[PDB]
Amino acid sequence: KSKSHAIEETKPFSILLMGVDTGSEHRKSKWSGNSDSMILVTINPKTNKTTMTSLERDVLIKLSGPKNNGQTGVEAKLNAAYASGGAEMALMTVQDLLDINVDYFMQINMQGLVDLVNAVGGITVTNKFDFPISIAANEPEYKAVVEPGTHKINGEQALVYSRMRYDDPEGDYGRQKRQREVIQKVLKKILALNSISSYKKILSAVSNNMQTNIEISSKTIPNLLAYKDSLEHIKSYQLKGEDATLSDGGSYQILTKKHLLAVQNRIKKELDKKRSKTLKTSAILYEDYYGLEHHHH
Numbered sequence: 001k002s003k004s005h006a007i008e009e010t011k012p013f014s015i016l017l018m019g020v021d022t023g024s025e026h027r028k029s030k031w032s033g034n035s036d037s038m039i040l041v042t043i044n045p046k047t048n049k050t051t052m053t054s055l056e057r058d059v060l061i062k063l064s065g066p067k068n069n070g071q072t073g074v075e076a077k078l079n080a081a082y083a084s085g086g087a088e089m090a091l092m093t094v095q096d097l098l099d100i101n102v103d104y105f106m107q108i109n110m111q112g113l114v115d116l117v118n119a120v121g122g123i124t125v126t127n128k129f130d131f132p133i134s135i136a137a138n139e140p141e142y143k144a145v146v147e148p149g150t151h152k153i154n155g156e157q158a159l160v161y162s163r164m165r166y167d168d169p170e171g172d173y174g175r176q177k178r179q180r181e182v183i184q185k186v187l188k189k190i191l192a193l194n195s196i197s198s199y200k201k202i203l204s205a206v207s208n209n210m211q212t213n214i215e216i217s218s219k220t221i222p223n224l225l226a227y228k229d230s231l232e233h234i235k236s237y238q239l240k241g242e243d244a245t246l247s248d249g250g251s252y253q254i255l256t257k258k259h260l261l262a263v264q265n266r267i268k269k270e271l272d273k274k275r276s277k278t279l280k281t282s283a284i285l286y287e288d289y290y291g292l293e294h295h296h297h
Contacts, residue, residue, distance in 0.1 A: 002213045004103045010226045012044035012271050015104035015213075016094055017052075017183070019162075020082070022109045031107065031211055035082040035090055036163075037179050040098065042270035043230050050230050051270055052183070053237045053263065054176040055094065058253040060241070061283040064096040065089040075284065077252065087211075096282035098264050100273065105213040112209035113162075114155030117182065119205045120189035125161055125181065126150040133164045158182050173238060180236045187231055196221055239263055242286055256286040 006013035019037035022030065038055040057079035064081075065072035071084040081093035087107055095102050108116070117123055127133050127146045134145035142163070144156045153161065162182045168174035190202060199221070214220075241255030257279055265275035279285075291297045 002104055002215065004101075006103050007214070007220075007223050007227075010045050010223065012042065012046060013103040014100065014267070014271050015041045015043070015106055016091055016102050017041050018082070018087075018090065018105070018107040019113060019179075020107050020109050029086075031109075032086055033082070033109075035079055036110070037176075038078070038090065038094070039180070039183070040094065040102070040267065042267055043227050044270055044272070045227050045230055046272075047270075048230055049233050049235070049270075051235045051237065051267070052180055053239055053267065054180060055097070055239050056172060056176075056241070056253050058172065058251065059097075059239070059283060060244075060252045060254050060289075061093060061097055063089065064092045064282050066092075077250075078283075093282070098267060099276065099280045100264065100268060100271070103271075106210065107212075108206060108210035110159055112206045113182070114159050115209065116155070116186055116202070116206050117153075117158040118155040119202050120186055120193070122152050122154050123158060123182065123185045123189060124150060124152045125158075125178075125185070127161075129167070131167065133161055133167075135160055135163050135165075138166070139163075173240060176238055177236075184234055184236070187234075191228060191231055196225065237263070237266075244289075254286045254289055255281075255283055260285070 017039045018035055020031065020033050021036040022033040035057060040053045040055060042051045055078060057077060059078040060075065061078045063071055063074050063076055065085045066088065069085050069089065071080065078093065078097065082090035087105065091102060091105055125146065127148045130148055132145035132147050136143050142160055144160045146153055146157050146161050162179045164178065165171055165175040190199065241253040244252050244254045246252055260281055260283065261276070261279040268275050287293045
């Protein structure tokens with residue numbers, strides 16, 4: 001489903017990486033649920049670099065999607081794209097958000113993350129807090145926790161470490177730094193194996209719980225390995241707007257023009273794309289919302 005050949009031509013590319021919470025029963029739909037995380041990833045084999053931009057789920061945006069969807073062209077939180085249109089709408093909504101075509105797309109459910117961490121023999125994280133990082137309170141199911149200090153945790157713990165939010169003053173932004181951390185570390189671990197055999201085993205270990213836009217076919221490793229060095233250096237960024245409360249008691253995130261442009265172009269420079277002087281997006285800007293631009297409005 002990838003009308004892109006960036007990997008077959010060792011050209012820099014963008015992949016929308018997503019963590020999906022598909023729930024308890026996966027009958028009707030197996031890949032339907034909520035965007036538990038959204039990160040736009042850039043990889044440039046040439047400049048030998050990688051960047052990760054987390055996308056705030058509470059960002060106010062005009063959902064983009066297929067006409068056959070009741071929620072297309074509707075103002076909601078960015079979180080709602082996947083929620084009411086899954087992968088496709090999330091992708092479309094994200095492409096319109098950043099004003100760019102997203103080469104690939106990858107989604108992994110919670111088991112996948114859990115398994116993935118465990119597959120590389122777990123990871124080591126530091127709990128800067130005094131209490132145990134946990135979400136048993138709001139999700140008694142996830143009883144695992146991360147005691148204060150440094151520890152090598154497992155998949156289950158790792159999941160809890162990247163979901164925690166309410167005990168973190170930084171809320172969803174704190175929660176995201178941690179989300180990026182787990183991703184970056186699991187890669188560092190994978191790559192260290194430095195074994196194509198070890199890789200095959202790992203991608204198959206998560207195989208049943210992750211769906212990609214990639215071909216992953218055979219003869220795909222020479223091509224992909226071409227970017228293994230690029231993963232050696234990751235610059236992480238967080239896309240965020242100013243907080244705001246609307247007609248409904250619901251709290252949102254409204255991006256400013258000055259910011260969203262810069263971030264787009266920063267990403268564009270990564271994929272070797274021309275940057276724009278004037279901004280275009282499907283998201284509600286801080287200025288057009290507060291009529292701060294002296295327009296007819």
